[PDB]
Every structure is written in structure tokens, then in C-alpha cells.
Amino acid sequence: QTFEGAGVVFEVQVEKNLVDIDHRLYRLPNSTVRNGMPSLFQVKPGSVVSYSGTVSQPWSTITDIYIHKQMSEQELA
Amino acid sequence: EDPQTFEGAGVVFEVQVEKNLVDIDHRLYRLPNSTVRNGMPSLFQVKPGSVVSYSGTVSQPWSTITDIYIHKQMSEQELAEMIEKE
Numbered sequence: 001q002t003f004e005g006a007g008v009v010f011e012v013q014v015e016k017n018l019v020d021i022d023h024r025l026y027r028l029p030n031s032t033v034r035n036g037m038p039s040l041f042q043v044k045p046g047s048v049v050s051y052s053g054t055v056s057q058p059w060s061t062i063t064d065i066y067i068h069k070q071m072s073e074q075e076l077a
Numbered sequence: 078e079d080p081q082t083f084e085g086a087g088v089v090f091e092v093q094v095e096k097n098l099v100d101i102d103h104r105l106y107r108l109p110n111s112t113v114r115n116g117m118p119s120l121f122q123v124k125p126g127s128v129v130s131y132s133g134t135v136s137q138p139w140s141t142i143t144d145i146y147i148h149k150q151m152s153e154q155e156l157a158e159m160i161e162k163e
């Protein structure tokens with residue numbers, strides 16, 4: 001039922017609530033929020049992330065995601 | 078590098094909800110009610126024993142955590158699945 005991982009965002013599809021992390025697709029609903037802002041609009045290609053969620057088919061749902069501030073800057077460079 | 082922002086990781090040892098303070102690896106940080114994740118203040122989610130990644134702004138007397146994530150060490154890990162496949 002639950003999972004946790006870490007990786008690098010390669011692509012974000014805001015219109016489909018999907019995020020591509022290390023070539024794996026996850027559902028990233030607007031309900032995954034931090035400081036009143038949906039995380040779907042904060043993650044970008046190159047973001048280094050820690051995430052957790054619930055197992056679902058075909059793609060698992062991320063219900064919590066954190067952007068590594070120093071590592072995402074190093075990844076983009 | 079921004080000298081006004083900070084980021085770290087550690088273990089929560091104590092939480093003082095009445096003073097908006099969190100003790101991580103015996104250092105103290107301000108954890109205001111405005112640091113919210115999924116509509117809930119993170120101050121009431123962190124507990125002694127929580128493993129955390131956090132970031133914020135340098136401030137006086139304590140630096141302010143504006144973003145904090147609890148590591149789910151008890152959940153099944155994608156890295157474990159990766160090591161099992163490799």
C-alpha cells in the first residue's frame with residue numbers, strides 16, 4: 001500500500017497530474033500541497049526529490065514530496 | 078549559494094508546540110504554524126524520533142524552518158526494490 005523513494009525529476013505533465021522521476025511515472029494530484037501551493041507546479045526537470053505515497057495502478061500516487069534545495073541547484077548545473 | 082537560506086537533515090529529539098520550536102540533533106529551530114503540508118501545520122506532524130529533511134530562512138533568535146519532510150523509514154523502499162532487481 002505505501003512506498004517511498006528519491007530521485008531526479010525528468011518531466012512534469014501538469015495537465016495530466018503526472019511527474020516523471022528517473023523514467024518512472026507517478027500520479028501527482030493537486031491535493032499534494034506545501035504552504036498552500038500544489039507541489040505539481042513547484043517540481044521542474046532537474047529537481048532532486050524525496051517522495052512518498054500510496055501504491056495504485058497503472059501509476060502510484062505521490063502524496064508527499066520534498067525538493068532538495070542545494071542538490072537541485074547542483075543537478076541543473 | 079544564499080547565506081540567508083539553509084538546508085539540513087537529522088532526527089527530531091523534541092517538539093515544543095507552545096513555543097513553535099523543534100529540536101533536531103540537539104539544535105533548535107523555529108517551526109511556525111505557517112509551515113504547512115497537506116493543510117496541516119508540520120509542527121503537529123513531527124514527533125521525537127522523526128527522521129527529517131528541512132529548509133528555511135536564517136533568523137534570530139532561531140532560524141525558521143519553512144519546509145520539512147518526514148522520511149517514511151517504515152514504508153517499503155524503492156531503493157530496496159532496486160537493490161533486489163540488481
Ligand SMILES: [Cl-]
Nearest residue numbers: 035036115116
Ligand atoms: Cl498546505
Ligand code: NA
Nearest residue numbers: 079080082083
Ligand atoms: Na543557503
